[PDB]
Amino acid sequence: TIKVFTTVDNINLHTQVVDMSMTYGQQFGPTYLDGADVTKIKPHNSHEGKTFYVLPNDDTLRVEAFEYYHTTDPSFLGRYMSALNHTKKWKYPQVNGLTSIKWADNNCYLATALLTLQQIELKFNPPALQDAYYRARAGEAANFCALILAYCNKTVGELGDVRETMSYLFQHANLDSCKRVLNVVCKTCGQQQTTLKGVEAVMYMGTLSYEQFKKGVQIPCTCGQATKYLVQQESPFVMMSAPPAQYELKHGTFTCASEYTGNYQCGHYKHITSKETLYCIDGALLTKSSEYKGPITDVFYKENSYTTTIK
Numbered sequence: 001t002i003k004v005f006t007t008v009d010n011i012n013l014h015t016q017v018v019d020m021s022m023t024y025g026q027q028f029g030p031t032y033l034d035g036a037d038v039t040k041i042k043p044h045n046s047h048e049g050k051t052f053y054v055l056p057n058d059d060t061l062r063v064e065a066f067e068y069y070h071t072t073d074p075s076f077l078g079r080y081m082s083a084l085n086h087t088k089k090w091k092y093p094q095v096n097g098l099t100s101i102k103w104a105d106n107n108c109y110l111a112t113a114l115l116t117l118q119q120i121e122l123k124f125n126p127p128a129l130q131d132a133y134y135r136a137r138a139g140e141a142a143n144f145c146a147l148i149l150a151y152c153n154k155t156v157g158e159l160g161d162v163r164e165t166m167s168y169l170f171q172h173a174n175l176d177s178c179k180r181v182l183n184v185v186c187k188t189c190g191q192q193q194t195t196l197k198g199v200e201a202v203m204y205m206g207t208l209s210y211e212q213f214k215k216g217v218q219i220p221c222t223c224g225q226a227t228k229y230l231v232q233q234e235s236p237f238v239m240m241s242a243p244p245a246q247y248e249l250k251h252g253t254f255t256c257a258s259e260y261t262g263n264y265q266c267g268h269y270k271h272i273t274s275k276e277t278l279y280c281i282d283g284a285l286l287t288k289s290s291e292y293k294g295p296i297t298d299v300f301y302k303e304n305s306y307t308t309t310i311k
């Protein structure tokens with residue numbers, strides 16, 4: 001008979017006494033140790049005092065599980081623990097003062113998202129996400145990467161899109177303050193104004209240039225081709241996306257960007273960031289140049305309060 005600690009958040013620890021003849025799953029339900037499914041294993045003696053994650057099976061654990069993760073999905077813990085088993089074996093080197101990921105298990109898109117998050121202002125709503133976000137900025141990003149996979153319903157090895165991953169993550173962040181007022185002008189229908197809030201205020205799909213979005217873009221009207229342009233923008237950042245195309249990035253005009261080379265889904269991501277010069281982060285590899293032209297699909301810009309001067 002050894003004594004262990006059960007938890008769902010690694011904050012509120014619940015003390016439990018176990019028998020070494022019954023498997024952990026027989027006594028606690030699905031039980032994990034550092035991501036490893038210990039349901040069908042029996043209590044060994046090094047397990048004394050260690051803390052185990054358990055699937056919630058009473059109301060106290062169910063409430064604590066939501067407080068930390070903001071989900072009642074019973075599959076979340078297993079998908080989280082399954083991803084953590086891999087991500088804690090990845091390497092997280094510091095590259096140009098940023099935490100990256102050494103290439104493994106098709107994690108190129110995760111590294112790009114991880115690098116981008118360290119350069120934009122964002123507060124996550126689930127304490128689980130915010131706490132691991134902090135530890136990731138400090139170099140320990142294994143837990144943060146596993147959570148990203150779980151929250152995106154993706155598995156280790158699956159092929160991932162950075163824009164899609166950021167969008168999922170943005171929906172779990174406090175972007176209530178973010179506002180985007182747009183104006184569409186049609187030669188016949190007229191002129192109409194719509195205001196966006198939250199995730200749609202900080203993302204646009206169609207062009208990489210924030211300036212071009214300010215000047216206006218050609219979009220079809222409900223009558224059949226108008227023009228939409230940005231009127232007001234109140235967000236700490238914006239994300240501009242377009243299907244991969246050749247694009248020139250100039251030092252000091254953007255924060256960071258996603259480079260995508262190769263076939264749809266089968267390709268590989270690289271990360272470009274603007275510092276004193278242009279830097280390219282490819283997992284553990286770093287290169288720098290003063291100019292850059294290449295296939296870009298996301299560009300991130302800084303923002304605070306913008307109001308247009310078009311009459």
Ligand SMILES: Cc1ccc(OC[C@@H]2CCCN2C)cc1C(=O)N[C@H](C)c1cc(-c2cnn(C)c2)nc2ccccc12
Pocket residue numbers: 159160161162242243244260262263264265266267297
């Ligand atoms: C790497 C990757 C993983 C997954 C993925 O999809 C997953 C699907 C998609 C829908 C929901 N999910 C389950 C996509 C890509 C991808 O290769 N992503 C790269 C940037 C990519 C994006 C787009 C695109 C996005 N929106 N639109 C209008 C066009 N077109 C591309 C054309 C050629 C080459 C790359 C393109």
Ligand SMILES: [Cl-]
Pocket residue numbers: 059062063
């Ligand atoms: Cl409940």
Ligand SMILES: [Cl-]
Pocket residue numbers: 059
């Ligand atoms: Cl209940």
Ligand SMILES: [Cl-]
Pocket residue numbers: 070071172
């Ligand atoms: Cl959620």
Ligand SMILES: [Cl-]
Pocket residue numbers: 103104106107108268
């Ligand atoms: Cl890769």
Ligand SMILES: [Cl-]
Pocket residue numbers: 151
């Ligand atoms: Cl979701």
Ligand SMILES: [Zn+2]
Pocket residue numbers: 059062
């Ligand atoms: Zn309840």
Ligand SMILES: [Zn+2]
Pocket residue numbers: 085086087089105156
């Ligand atoms: Zn792995």
Ligand SMILES: [Zn+2]
Pocket residue numbers: 071151172
């Ligand atoms: Zn969710």
Ligand SMILES: [Zn+2]
Pocket residue numbers: 186187188189190221222223224226
């Ligand atoms: Zn019209």
Ligand SMILES: [Zn+2]
Pocket residue numbers: 106107108109266267268269
């Ligand atoms: Zn890849």
